[PDB]
Amino acid sequence: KYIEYPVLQKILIGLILGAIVGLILGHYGYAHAVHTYVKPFGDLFVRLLKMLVMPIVFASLVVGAASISPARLGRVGVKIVVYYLLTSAFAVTLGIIMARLFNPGAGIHLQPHQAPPLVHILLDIVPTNPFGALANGQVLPTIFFAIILGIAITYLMNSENEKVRKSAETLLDAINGLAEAMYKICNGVMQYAPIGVFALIAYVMAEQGVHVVGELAKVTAAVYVGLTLQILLVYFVLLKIYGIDPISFIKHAKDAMLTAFVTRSSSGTLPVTMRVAKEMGISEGIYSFTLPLGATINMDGTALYQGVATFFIANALGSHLTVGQQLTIVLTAVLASIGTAGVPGAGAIMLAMVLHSVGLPLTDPNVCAAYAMILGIDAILDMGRTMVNVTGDLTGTAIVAKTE
Amino acid sequence: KYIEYPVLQKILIGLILGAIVGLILGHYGYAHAVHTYVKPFGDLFVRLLKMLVMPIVFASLVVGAASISPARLGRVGVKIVVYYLLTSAFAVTLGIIMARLFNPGAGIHLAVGGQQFQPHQAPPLVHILLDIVPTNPFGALANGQVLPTIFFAIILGIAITYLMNSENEKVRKSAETLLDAINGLAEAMYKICNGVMQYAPIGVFALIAYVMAEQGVHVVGELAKVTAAVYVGLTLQILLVYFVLLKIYGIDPISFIKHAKDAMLTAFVTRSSSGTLPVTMRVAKEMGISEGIYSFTLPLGATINMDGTALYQGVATFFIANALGSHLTVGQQLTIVLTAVLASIGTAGVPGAGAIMLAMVLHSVGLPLTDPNVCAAYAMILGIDAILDMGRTMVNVTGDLTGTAIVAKTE
Amino acid sequence: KYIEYPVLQKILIGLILGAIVGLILGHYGYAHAVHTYVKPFGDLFVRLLKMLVMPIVFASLVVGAASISPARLGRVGVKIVVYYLLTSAFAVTLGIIMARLFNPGAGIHLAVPLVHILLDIVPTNPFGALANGQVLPTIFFAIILGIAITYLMNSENEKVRKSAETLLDAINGLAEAMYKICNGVMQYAPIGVFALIAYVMAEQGVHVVGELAKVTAAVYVGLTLQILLVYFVLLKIYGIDPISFIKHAKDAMLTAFVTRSSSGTLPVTMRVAKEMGISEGIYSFTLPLGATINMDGTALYQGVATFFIANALGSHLTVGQQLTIVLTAVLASIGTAGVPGAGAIMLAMVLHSVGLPLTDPNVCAAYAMILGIDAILDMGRTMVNVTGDLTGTAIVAKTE
Ligand SMILES: N[C@@H](CC(=O)O)C(=O)O
Ligand SMILES: N[C@@H](CC(=O)O)C(=O)O
Ligand SMILES: N[C@@H](CC(=O)O)C(=O)O
Ligand code: NA
Ligand code: NA
Ligand code: NA
Ligand code: NA
Ligand code: NA
Ligand code: NA
């Protein structure tokens, strides 16, 4: 196959090259040649992610749910979990604002059902038959239940019976790996990403004209200017109130951010994140505990990412978001960020989750396309997103080591 | 949350307190305030049990099926398994009689929200005897459809045991791990059932509250008509089965109860046959039972042989049937006994267990829980379940010790 | 229970004596009891086969997909993949000639794209798919799943390495358990088969007579003809003994022929794969894959049927649809499960394409006479699909 190139560039080629080929066929050779000979390669890519969604959702959430479970942790974690909870919680609230002062999707307009009298949906979050729910789509209850199980398991491990203790581990580990196996396919999909994305954005550059680019960069801005604002108004702020020098903090994390920015793998940048921790005076039994938990949990760069991407979709349909469903985003996107893997694609797919909630199924055509536009450019947003995901751990690690 | 109270009382408060509040709103503040502000809390409770049904059914039956499998047992068990089979088998037959001389449900006939239940007919025997066999295990296990889920799950539970005796080591290993995955999956469920029983006080309160506001007091006259049919069947089991088979083997039946005094009464209160086991083992030594005998029967009697439940279901069914006004046919009546036993063998030995296994003995015979009229009628049993549960457990434990004292006579 | 006998013979009792009591009480007899108190024991059997297929295919083709872990990455398959294509894409070519030399149709003639489907090889959600039917993707996923897991095997992390095996081993046994059920089914088969081929001996066979046996001709002297001018053809050119080849398979095919199930006679297929010196990994992969895709016996059959239907109408085939048949007919044997009924059914879209809908009565009728004799025809067809896999398995094993 001879296709050995470094993924990031290898894809950033198919993005810029795919744009132009789309525009040169925006005029000239018209719109029916692409909608038949290029996009069929796009859908494939997307549907390979679709594929992954339900199992990853399920498995990831259980593995996540068994990793947190209170109280299966020392109070050394309590300070940082609360930190993780609130650094992620406010992150998406900021994402709302970036989706408020910037309105991406509104003007790109290219139909959903009502809500029952609150009773049913608050009940509907509870599955009827776990299998049947997990079977065909329906994400919302899949969450609820999966968690309830992930918790149950941890309490089988502390049960006095040895076989019961044994039953817990094995089962959990079966879901784990099932978890992990998924990701090697996600990476197996990211090898198809260059040929995949090329076809996608190519279709979106042929139809809809150039108005897309004026909105794509309007998303990308709303995101990146929210990202740095997070660092400046949250990190830089909470660094000052605890006596830590915020300028030299960045100089010590210089390698930890920039290696994470390029690789886009928070779970892969961890030894680099651990190496930086020692270089600025953080205790052993402190950073060997927080960083391995920050590698999976606390994904504020993603939590925000989804909170915006949603508004995009909403406005790209021309649907106005209500409060009650707006405060659902923040409730979901967090649970979504806590679920996310810490790998190239991860976030994008977890977005699907924060979409099936609020009444936006991916089986619907208008969702497919609009989502695929985010998915095409995902790679760009992904880089900065990761960079912030890693900063959130070290800042918390430097903060929790102050009051200990 | 500060809600630390002992479950039994903590719930028996919400039952008696919930009754009165229902009746005082039976008149006065009328029927539309409850059907909107209290019952939405009830359904939640119920649906948390619904949730559990399919997986527990599946997992429990496989774990059960791999625990019995003949011949994966010494002849020391053959005498007691046959005993377990026939003590449970006749128990529900008695339950039929208690549902015959007492007719609970007949005269309570309801249509709830305007939906008179009209279940469907039976095909010419061929299809259903075939339909017990799944088309695609997954698809069956997926959306409801309990009947074939049973059949298949068992067939698997048996298969597994025969992978363990296979000469290949990796195959032997494959068997254990897989089975253990289903196990735990089995067990994990139960910690959620107990997690549901912590919601039971707030749950049940809302349920019986709705049933005391609508239908009037005629419910109580029938609820206690069930409870009677049950309890007077329960003691009759002990007196006409246990006390009878105790006499034919030379065992003194009066002092037997004096030695099992702690074993019954601790089981009566806790309602956990799987939790009362060390107490059941301690009593066994106190009346002269051999070691390699009670260390084998009691751990098997803790899960299998649930005659107090087998009967419980055999009645509860008639309740539902008559509560709809549907007359039960023989052919389907002898299905009850066939099912309720397999249901009792599946049941866990924990606070809720039985009630949920009832759902199983309902999907069989043509009574799905997706149907509205079933929901409500079942929820009435589920509300009072806690009461029946206590005596049920007490009998479930007596059935093991009596068998243990009997099988140690001819050995 | 007394019933312990070897099945080699036990069903050969219930088949030979399945023909005696069948015909004797097939004449006179009355009450047509076979279709009321006998068949309910025939179908029961079949139904258990329909039960296994999904699980086993899944369980197996993750397990087999987890052993070839760079035995050639997985590009051992690439070779057999294409073996499958041309065993099929030449089997149908033979059927076109079979239907050129035999004309079942005229004499009783009367008036009473590619896109989505290839994407559809990729599933939406495993569970949803896996749950209710849906074959191809179920494979696809499992294969790809199988692959991924092995990369977890050698991954530097200890518990993650551990995550794989435990999980996989769970998928195994879930495999092996299923297998040992196929053989609780075959110990029932004497009772099963007897009951069914009692219905097959009361009607069928002597019906309706020539035009149908005109197909049955183009069938059996084409099936057997496949073997000789294809299988034995490449057996020689790959140094594999044609004589013993069949004799190593002696029981595999002769069970498959009777059982008519691909996935019910896969246990024996592999038990025969061991008998002729085949490596576990290779066979534990190819066979289960071929045990669904490459059903050449069907690929041929469907064509002849199509032609029969066409010639039975009085409307004739241009080499503008002729080519598209050799095209679609394969894609049908691609999607066919491997269980008794599906042959005639899948045959539908090789007719819907080309353009012959079962909504014109002439169709959903003439068809229903091929559908009549299918019961007989299904037996011969089955046997072929399986051989034409073992064949390729050995051939590709030769180049290793
Ligand atoms: N790839 C990101 C996670 C994401 O895509 O959401 C990371 O490693 O931090
Ligand atoms: N809880 C009962 C079982 C049941 O509810 O059926 C017991 O432990 O014996
Ligand atoms: N049952 C056949 C396929 C068919 O003709 O339907 C086989 O397994 O080979
Ligand atoms: Na995460
Ligand atoms: Na992180
Ligand atoms: Na039981
Ligand atoms: Na018991
Ligand atoms: Na085949
Ligand atoms: Na096929």
Q: What is the domain-level CATH number for residue A60?
A: 1.10.3860.10
B273 Cβ below 6 A of ligand 2: yes
Tell me, yes or no, whether C252 lies in a domain: yes
| Region for A283 from its dihedrals, namely left if φ exceeds 0, alpha if ψ lies in -120 to 50, beta otherwise | beta
Q: Element (H or E) spanning A207, and its range? A: none
Residues A18, A198 contacting (CB under 8 angstroms) = yes
Q: Which of A170, A77, A10 is nearest to A396 (CA)?
A: A77
CB-based contact B277:B302 (threshold 8 Å) = yes
Give, in degrees to the nearest 5, the angle at Cα A287 between A284 and A289: 105
Q: Reduce the secondary structure of C34-100 to three states and give it as a string.
A: HHHHHHHHHHHHHHHHHHHHHHHHHHHHHHHHHCCCCCCCCCHHHHHHHHHHHHHHHHHHHHHHHHH
Distance CA C223, CA C216 (A): 10
Q: C274, C371, C355, C247: which is closest to C310 by C-alpha? A: C355
Cα-flanking dihedrals φ and ψ of residue A330, to 5°?
-55, -40
Helices (DSSP H) in C260-362: which residue ranges?
A: 267-273, 280-290, 296-313, 322-335, 342-346, 349-352
Give the residue carrying structure tokens 């912030």.
A388
Q: Which of residues 167-186 of B touch A (CB under 8 A)?
A: 177, 180-181, 183-185
Query: Does A2 map to a domain?
Result: no
The 8-class DSSP code of residue C151 comes to H
Question: d(Cα A261, Cα A256) in Å, to the nearest integer?
Answer: 9
A167 touches A156 (CB < 8 A): yes
Gap from CA of A381 to ligand 1 centroid (Å): 10
C292 close to C121: Cβ distance less than 8 angstroms? no
B129 chain-C contacts, CB cut-off 8 A = 40, 44
A216: helix, strand or coil:
helix
DSSP state of B252: -
Question: Which are the residues after which chain B is interrupted (C to N > 2.5 Å)?
Answer: none
In a domain, B319, yes or no: yes
Q: How many Cβ atoms are within 10 Å of A139's Cβ, its own excluded?
A: 21
- Residue C81 belongs to a domain: yes
Q: What type of residue sits at position A305? A: Y
Distance B344 CA to ligand 2 centre (A): 9
- d(Cα B407, Cα B296) in Å, to the nearest integer? 11
Nearest CB partner across the interface for A129, out of B43, B143, B177: B143
- Contact partners, residue B364, CB within 8 Å, separation at least 6: B146, B147, B335, B339
On whether the CB atoms of residues B403 and B83 are closer than 8 A, the answer is yes
Give helix then strand counts, H and E, for chain B.
19, 0
Taking alpha carbons only, the member of B155, B11, B296 closest to residue C52 is B155
C343 touches ligand 3 (CB under 6 Å): yes
User: Where do the DSSP E strands lie in A245-295?
Assistant: none
For residue C18, the Cα-to-chain-centroid distance in whole angstroms is 24
Q: Is C180 exposed, middle or buried (0-12, 13-18, 19+ CB in 10 A)?
A: middle
In angstroms, the CA A147 to CA A138 distance is 15
For ligand 2, pick from B298, B347, B384, B401 the residue to mutate: most ligand atoms within 8 Å of CB: B347
Q: State how far the Cα of C186 lies from the Cα of C255, in Å rounded to an integer.
A: 10
B64-73: burial string, b at 16+ Cβ within 10 Å, e else: bbbbbbeeee
Distance CA B119, CA C249 (A): 53
Q: Which residues of C touch A177 (CB under 8 A)?
A: 149, 152, 160, 163-164, 166-167
Amino acid of residue A268: G
Any domain includes A373: yes
Neighbors of chain A with 3 or more C-beta pairs under 8 Å:
B, C
- Report the distance separating Cα C156 and Cα C164, nearest Å: 12
- Domain count across chain B: 1
Q: Return the bridge partners of C105, or none.
A: C107
| Cα gap A133→A148, rounded to integer Å | 15
CA A237 to chain centre: 25
User: H-type helices in B25-145, by residue range?
Assistant: 34-37, 39-68, 75-101, 126-131, 137-142
Does residue B1 fall inside a structural domain? no
Contact (CB, 8 A) for A304 and A94: yes
Mutate to test the pocket of ligand 3, among C88, C293, C295 (most ligand atoms within 8 A of CB): C295
Q: Tokens 């007077």 sit at which residue?
A: B232
Distance (Å, whole) CA B81 – CA B75: 10
Residue B239 is classified by DSSP as I
Q: What is the DSSP string of B282-309?
A: HHHHTTT--HHHHHHHHHHHTTS--HHH
Per-residue HEC secondary structure of A336-377 comes to: HHHHCCCCCCCHHHHHHHHHHCCCCCCCCHHHHHHHHHHHHH
Unique residue bearing structure tokens 């830590």 = A244
Please report whether residue C1 resides in a domain.
no
Report whether C56 contacts C340 (CB < 8 A). Answer: no
Q: How far away, in angstroms, is C250 Cα from ligand 8 center?
A: 17
Residue from C285, C303, C302, C282 nearest C397 by CA: C282
Please give the Cα distance from A183 to A346 (Å, whole number).
8
Please count the CA atoms within 13 angstroms of the CA of C309 that sit on its side-chain side. Answer: 30
3 state SS of C107: strand
Report whether residue B88 contacts ligand 2, using a CB cutoff of 6 Å. Answer: no
**C95 touches C301 (CB < 8 A):** yes
3-state DSSP assignment of residue C231: helix
A113, C121, C330, C337 from C134: Cα distances, Å: 29, 10, 18, 9
Mutate to test the interface with A, among C69, C119, C121, C127 (most CBs of A within 10 A): C127
- The first and second tokens of residue A343, run together, are 């790998």
The helix-helix angle for A39-68 and A365-400 (nearest 10°) equals 40
User: Which atom from ligand 2 is nearest to the alpha carbon of B276?
Assistant: 8
- Residue C105: helix, strand or coil by DSSP? strand
Resolution reading in Å:
4.7
Please tell me the residue having the least CA distance from ligand 1 atom 7. Answer: A342
Distance of alpha carbon C247 from alpha carbon A282, whole angstroms: 73
Contacts of C124 (CB under 8 A, 6+ apart): A47, A50, A51
User: For residue C392, which phi and psi values (nearest 5 degrees)?
Assistant: -65, -35
Q: Is C360 left (phi over 0), alpha (psi -120 to 50) or beta?
A: beta
Is there a cis peptide before residue A71, judged by omega within 30 degrees of 0? yes
Residues C251 and B402: their CA atoms lie apart, in Å, by 54
Q: Which residue of B has its CA nearest to C132?
A: B139
Q: Range of C367's domain?
A: 7-112+117-398
Please name the residues in contact with C213: beta carbons below 8 A apart, sequence gap of 6 or more.
none
For residue C102, which phi and psi values (nearest 5 degrees)? -115, 135
Q: Does A1 reside within a domain?
A: no
Which residues, by Cβ under 5 Å, contact ligand 7, an ion? B 273, 305-306, 396
Atom of ligand 2 nearest to the CA of B275: 8
From atom 5 of ligand 1, which residue's Cα is the shortest distance away?
A347
CB atoms within 10 A of CB A189: 22
Q: Hey, what amino acid is at A36?
A: T
Distance CA C87, CA C83 (A): 6
Return d(Cα A350, Cα B183) in angstroms, integer. 30
**Residue C107: strand pairing partners:** C105
Structure tokens of B298? 């009691």
Cis preceding linkage at B206, omega within 30? no
Answer for the pair A212, A40: CB distance below 8 angstroms, yes or no: no
Q: Are C283 and C61 in contact (CB under 8 A)?
A: no
Choose among B191, B241, B232: nearest CA to B352. B191
> Among A257, A264, A394, which is best to mutate for testing ligand 1, by the most ligand atoms less than 8 A from CB?
A264
At residue A335's C-alpha, the angle toward residues A330 and A341, to 5°, is: 130
Torsion (CA) B396, B397, B401, B406 in degrees, nearest 10: 0
Alpha carbon distance A202, B382 (integer Å) = 60
